[PDB]
Amino acid sequence: VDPDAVAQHDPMHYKVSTFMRTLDLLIARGDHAYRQLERDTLNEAKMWYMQALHLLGDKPYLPLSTTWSDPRLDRAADITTQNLTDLFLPQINEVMMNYWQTLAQRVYNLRHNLSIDGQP
Amino acid sequence: AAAAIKSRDDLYQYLLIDNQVSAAIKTTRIAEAIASIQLYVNRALENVE
Amino acid sequence: VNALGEKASSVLAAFEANSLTAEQLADAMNLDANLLLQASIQAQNHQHLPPVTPENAFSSWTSINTILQWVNVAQQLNVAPQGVSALVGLDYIQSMKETPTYAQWENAAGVLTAGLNSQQANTLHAFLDESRSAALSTYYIRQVAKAAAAIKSRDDLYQYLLIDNQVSAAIKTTRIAEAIASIQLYVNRALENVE
Amino acid sequence: EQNFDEANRWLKYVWSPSGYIVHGQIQNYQWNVRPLLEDTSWNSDPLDS
Amino acid sequence: SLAMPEYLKRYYNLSDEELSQFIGKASNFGQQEYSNNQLITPVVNSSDGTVKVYRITREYTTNAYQMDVELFPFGGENYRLDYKFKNFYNASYLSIKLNDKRELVRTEGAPQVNIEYSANITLNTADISQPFEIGLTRVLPSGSWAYAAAKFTVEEYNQYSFLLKLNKAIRLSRATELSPTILEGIVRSVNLQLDINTDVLGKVFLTKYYMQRYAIHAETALILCNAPISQRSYDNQPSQFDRLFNTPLLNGQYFSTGDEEIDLNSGSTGDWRKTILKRAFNIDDVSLFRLLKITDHDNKDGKIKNNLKNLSNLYIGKLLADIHQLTIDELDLLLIAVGEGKTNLSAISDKQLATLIRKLNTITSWLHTQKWSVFQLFIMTSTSYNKTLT
Amino acid sequence: SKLENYTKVMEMLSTFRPSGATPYHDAYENVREVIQLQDPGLEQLNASPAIAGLMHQASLLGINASISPELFNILTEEITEGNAEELYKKNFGNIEPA
Assess contact for E82 and E116: CB atoms under 8 A.
yes
Helix or strand run (H / E) with residue F55: none
- Tell me the CA distances in angstroms from A45 to B11, E4, E191, one per residue in order: 20, 34, 52
Across the interface, do E282 and C117 touch by the CB < 8 Å criterion? yes
E107: nearest Cα among E86, E125, E128, E83: E83
In whole angstroms, what is the distance from residue E358 CA to residue E366 CA?
12
Q: How long a stretch of residues is chain E?
A: 390
Instruction: Phi first, then psi: give them for residue E32, nearest 5 degrees.
Output: -85, -20
E213: nearest Cα among E22, E358, E370: E358
Measured in angstroms, the CA of B1 and the nearest CA of chain E are apart by: 15
- Tell me the CA distances in angstroms from F85 to C143, F90, F97, one per residue in order: 22, 9, 11
Chains A and D are in contact, defined as 3 or more C-beta pairs closer than 8 angstroms: no
Chains D and F are in contact, defined as 3 or more C-beta pairs closer than 8 angstroms: no
Bond before C50 cis per omega within 30 degrees: yes
Chain A environment of B40 (Cβ under 8 Å): none
Give the largest CA-CA distance in chain A.
64
- Tell me E341's DSSP state: G
CA angle F57-F61-F67, nearest 5°? 125
Q: Which residue of F has its CA nearest to C153?
A: F20
Measured in angstroms, the CA of B30 and the nearest CA of chain E are apart by: 30
Assess contact for A83 and E27: CB atoms under 8 A.
no
Q: How long a stretch of residues is chain D?
A: 49
- Tell me the CA distances in angstroms from D47 to D37, D38, D42, E189, one per residue in order: 21, 19, 11, 90
In whole angstroms, what is the distance from residue E81 CA to residue F24 CA?
47
3-state secondary structure labels for all residues of chain B: CCCCCCCHHHHHHHHCCCCCCCCCCCCCHHHHHHHHHHHHHHHHHCCCC
3-state secondary structure labels for all residues of E3-68: CCHHHHHHHHCCCHHHHHHHHCCHHHHCCCCCECCEEEEEECCCCCCCCEEEEEEEEEEECHHHEE
Residues 25-54 of E with CB under 8 A from A: 44, 46-47, 49
CB proximity list for C80: less than 8 A, separation 6 or greater: C35, C38, C74, C111, E266, E284, E285, E286
* Interior/surface letters B17-29, b for 16+ CB within 10 angstroms, e for the rest: ebeeeeeeeeeee
- How was this structure obtained? cryo-EM
In whole angstroms, what is the distance from residue E10 CA to residue D36 CA?
73
Measured in angstroms, the CA of E257 and the nearest CA of chain F are apart by: 20
Point out the residue among E248, E250, E388 whose CB comes nearest to the CB of C110: E250
Q: How long a stretch of residues is chain F?
A: 98
Chains A and B are in contact, defined as 3 or more C-beta pairs closer than 8 angstroms: yes
CB proximity list for F92: less than 8 A, separation 6 or greater: F18
Assess contact for E135 and E97: CB atoms under 8 A.
yes
Assess contact for A99 and A56: CB atoms under 8 A.
yes
Across the interface, do F29 and C131 touch by the CB < 8 Å criterion? yes
- Tell me F41's DSSP state: G
Across the interface, do F34 and C113 touch by the CB < 8 Å criterion? yes
CB proximity list for B30: less than 8 A, separation 6 or greater: none
In whole angstroms, what is the distance from residue D40 CA to residue E242 CA?
65
Measured in angstroms, the CA of E237 and the nearest CA of chain A are apart by: 18
What residues are paired with D31 via a beta bridge?
Answer: D15
Across the interface, do F59 and C127 touch by the CB < 8 Å criterion? no
3-state secondary structure of E192: coil
Cβ of residue C191 closer than 8 Å to a chain D Cβ: yes
CB proximity list for E137: less than 8 A, separation 6 or greater: E94, E95, E96, E97, E100, E145, E146, E147, E148
In whole angstroms, what is the distance from residue C87 CA to residue C96 CA?
17
Across the interface, do B6 and E13 touch by the CB < 8 Å criterion? no
Question: What is the secondary structure of E219-276 as a DSSP string?
Answer: HHHHHHTT-PPP-S--TTS--HHHHHHTSSPBTTB-----SSEE---GGG---HHHHH
- Tell me A93's DSSP state: P
> Exposed/middle/buried for E293, CB within 10 Å: 0-12, 13-18, 19+?
middle
CB proximity list for A87: less than 8 A, separation 6 or greater: A68, A71, A76, A79, A80
CA angle F61-F66-F70, nearest 5°? 105
- Tell me the CA distances in angstroms from E86 to E94, E112, F36, one per residue in order: 15, 9, 56
Assess contact for E120 and E79: CB atoms under 8 A.
yes
In whole angstroms, what is the distance from residue D1 CA to residue C174 CA?
34
Across the interface, do E11 and B8 touch by the CB < 8 Å criterion? no
For chain F, first and last CA: distance in Å?
29
Say how many C-beta atoms besides its own lie within 10 A of residue A59's C-beta: 15
Give every strand in the sheet of E67-75, ordered side by side: E67-75, E78-85, E116-119
For chain A, first and last CA: distance in Å?
46
Cβ of residue A82 closer than 8 Å to a chain E Cβ: no
Name the neighbours of C, counting chains with at least 3 Cβ pairs within 8 A: D, E, F
Q: Which of C188, C193, C194, C195 to mutate to test the interface with D (most CBs of D within 10 A)?
A: C193
Q: Which amino acid is at E323?
A: I
Q: Which residue of E has its CA nearest to C31?
A: E329
Assess contact for C139 and F22: CB atoms under 8 A.
yes
C73: nearest Cα among E329, E280, E274, F49: F49
Cβ of residue C121 closer than 8 Å to a chain F Cβ: no
Q: What are B17-25's contacts with CB under 8 Å, separation 24+?
A: B18/A46, B18/A111, B20/A111, B21/A111, B22/A111, B22/A112, B22/A113, B24/A112, B24/A113, B25/A113
CB pairs under 8 A between E and F: 7
In whole angstroms, what is the distance from residue E284 CA to residue A39 CA?
66
What residues are paired with E53 via a beta bridge?
Answer: E42, E157
A117: nearest Cα among A62, A19, A57, A37: A37
In whole angstroms, what is the distance from residue E268 CA to residue E285 CA?
10
